[PDB]
DNA sequence: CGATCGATCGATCGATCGATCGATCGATCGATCGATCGATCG
């Protein structure tokens with residue numbers, strides 16, 4: 724399930740699904756989908772059978788809401804109203820508010836004629852004195868960004884942040900598994916104490932920041948996975 | 953009218969501080985090792 728819909732203190736429930744023939748290889752890890760399928764179980768505790776889904780069909784606003792948001796676009800003070808709306812509990816700080824607003828929208832994607840892609844994400848570093856509500860600014864973004872992941876520098880790892888390869892005990896096969904920086908694909912991630920994380924985690928971030936990709940080379944397999952984070 | 957003695961200038965040694973380099977010891981992050989328990993195939 725979506726981590727945004729998961730209240731704190733809970734790990735999102737994971738469910739195994741199977742697809743065959745033309746429905747295979749449509750979705751990679753980190754892709755948000757809508758599922759139509761059959762709920763069932765199969766043996767693989769005392770009698771704890773592992774649930775699984777036979778996939779039948781996967782897909783991946785109100786008219787008045789469109790007019791409501793179009794009216795919001797037509798507001799003469801739209802930019803300043805939204806600027807004030809970002810963390811209204813805090814005072815002043817208009818410039819940092821406005822940059823974070825730019826973070827929410829992000830840039831527009833462009834593709835070179837040679838096939839390369841320009842990174843559209845806007846990444847901002849807060850580098851000031853302690854006690855300036857800089858931690859609170861990240862927390863508010865987590866509650867406004869539809870796709871939001873918040874993690875600390877200390878309690879994170881390159882395998883935890885980026886992708887990893889692990890064996891699924893349900894089907895006894897090695898699966899490619901995404902991480903925190905993979906879940907936040909197509910959204911915004913809030914990392915705190917960025918200075919406190921190790922260089923290897925930073926190095927993996929460099930590929931994500933400047934190429935929107937994560938390259939995995941573990942055990943005896945190599946792969947590259949995109950991450951528009 | 954020469955005489956006593958008080959007060960300052962420059963040579964000049966020396967001694968006290970500054971600073972730079974170099975040697976030495978301690979604080980600290982990374983590489984390495986172990987373990988245990990899961991499956992895979994022999």
Ligand SMILES: Nc1ncnc2c1ncn2[C@@H]1O[C@H](COP(=O)(O)OP(=O)(O)O)[C@@H](O)[C@H]1O
Pocket residue numbers: 812813814815816852853854855856857858859860
């Ligand atoms: N301009 C401000 N308006 C309101 N509260 C503020 C402002 N600046 C700082 N604060 C207070 O500072 C706290 C957040 O500080 P935080 O960013 O967590 O400190 P740190 O930088 O050490 O992480 C909040 O409790 C908030 O009330």
